[PDB]
């Protein structure tokens, strides 16, 4: 999943009075100040794109309400129950939270209500054999060995499309079964031909 | 610290380095890292797929001998957690084990921790993939007995097709 991940927080140390309200400041300033160390709980190998420059933006409002967004490609674990495959469905999670700070230090909230706090672009679908039916947004708690933590979770609901695996296995298998059943209409004395049907159909089904 | 049997590994770096630094008033330091590592596990496959493998992570100090650094497992046998939650698709973790010892090198002795898992393979996939075609082809091969001797073409086609199917099962197994 490719995301613009936006965070915002108050920082009383970074209030100012100046000619302009919000400083659309360079992304270099992100390293000079404290920022949340948000990490993805189920992420495997995520990429923070930095072509041509680190794809982050930081803005400081006059009151001190910092906004800070970054461009990421996160690949995360989506455990699957393949009992009903290819006619199954999945709810892939996307869960993130502070790595170092517990509940008593940093707490995560949604910018708007959870339904509209996560938005998917209309053309943003690189899914070949899946249909993204929708998303459900929630928050929860995790009690790690270091302490308590707040984990913000989204669940993307996906339904597998059946046409590919139909053409892959079901149609060839059905045609093979009909081909085997064709043997009944031959004469009983055509032993080599009927044996050829039987063995060839067995081999095809084995493959 | 380093991992002796590590092939390739990295510390997660999104949104930042998944690292934790906590200082307590008594001078205690807690240092956490989210690490993904691919570690070598030498697998004995003579009993494959009805096998039982033993894979170990090998934590060791590189530059400091036992005179400088002493490893230990914090919390004893309760140190390693979350193993019970893992459901591998092929394997199942029969048990896990923690060991602490000292390993001797030319430079000197060093502390050593070992975290081992005893994985046991599941046979359902192999039963569906390799075995069951083999038995069913074996029953297929015996149909030639019930055909008359004079009908040579039928029995020959049956035998040759059974041999071909055994060979293609074997090669589609050994390819992977």
């Amino acid at each position, epitope marked *: 999943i490719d995301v613009f991940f936006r965070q915002s927080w108050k920082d009383e140390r970074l209030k100012f009075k100046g000619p302009m309200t919000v400083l659309r400041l360079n992304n270099l300033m992100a390293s000079k100040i404290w920022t949340p160390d948000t990490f993805f*709980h*189920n992420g495997k190998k995520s990429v923070a794109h930095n072509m041509t420059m680190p794809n982050k933006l930081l803005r400081i409002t006059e009151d001190g309400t910092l906004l800070y967004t970054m461009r990421l490609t996160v690949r995360a674990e989506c*455990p699957m*129950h393949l009992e009903d495959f290819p006619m199954d*469905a*999945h*709810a892939c*999670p996307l*869960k993130f939270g502070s790595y170092a700070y517990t509940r008593a230090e940093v707490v995560y909230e949604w910018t708007r209500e959870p339904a509209r706090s996560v938005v998917v672009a209309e053309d943003g679908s690189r899914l070949n054999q899946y249909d993204l*039916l*929708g998303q*459900t947004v*929630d*928050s*929860g*708690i*995790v*009690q*790690s060995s270091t302490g308590e933590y707040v*984990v913000m*979770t989204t*669940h993307f*609901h996906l339904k597998r499309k059946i046409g590919y695996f139909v053409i892959q296995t079901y149609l060839p298998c059905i045609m093979t079964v009909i081909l085997s059943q064709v043997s009944f209409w031959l004469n009983r004395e055509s032993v080599p031909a009927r044996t050829v049907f039987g063995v060839t159909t067995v081999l095809t089904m084995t493959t | 610290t380093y991992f002796l049997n590590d092939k390739k590994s990295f510390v997660h770096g999104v949104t930042v380095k998944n690292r934790m630094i906590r200082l307590h008033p008594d001078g205690t330091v807690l240092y956490g890292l989210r690490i993904t590592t691919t570690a070598a596990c030498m697998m004995d496959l003579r009993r494959y797929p009805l096998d039982e493998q033993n894979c170990t992570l090998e934590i060791e100090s590189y530059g400091y001998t036992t005179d400088d650094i002493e490893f230990y497992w914090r919390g004893g046998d309760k140190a390693v957690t*979350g193993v*019970e*939650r893992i*459901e591998l698709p092929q394997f199942s973790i029969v048990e896990h084990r923690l060991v602490s010892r000292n390993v001797v090198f030319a430079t000197g002795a060093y502390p050593r921790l070992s975290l081992s898992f005893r994985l046991k393979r599941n046979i359902g996939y192999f039963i569906l993939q390799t075995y069951m075609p083999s038995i069913l082809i074996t029953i297929l091969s015996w149909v030639s007995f019930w055909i008359n001797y004079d009908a040579s073409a039928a029995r020959v086609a049956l035998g040759i097709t059974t041999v071909l199917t055994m060979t293609t099962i074997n090669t589609h197994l050994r390819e992977t």
Partner: nanobody
Amino acid sequence: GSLRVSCAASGRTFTTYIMAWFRQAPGKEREFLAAMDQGRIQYYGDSVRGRFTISRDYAKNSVDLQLDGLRPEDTAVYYCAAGAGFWGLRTASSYHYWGQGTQVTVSS
């Protein structure tokens, strides 16, 4: 008063499934109480947030709910469910496995 209710599974390992609790009062629909995920992640309903605590023992394949600070209108039959959350994690329709239900009553 305080209470603890356990829910043990059998015939199927639910280590990879989401295990949740629901409440049914007389004359009301099913209400979601709490849920625990494979990653030891806890979700709680607003009506019972901060009071009830959900835990999962993966070794013996069970989910436990610890109820504290009971108040009289919490009397109801409590159901234990396990399943993968599709369109859900808060809706009863997303779960396929359910318990027979245990009655709970509070006397004033």
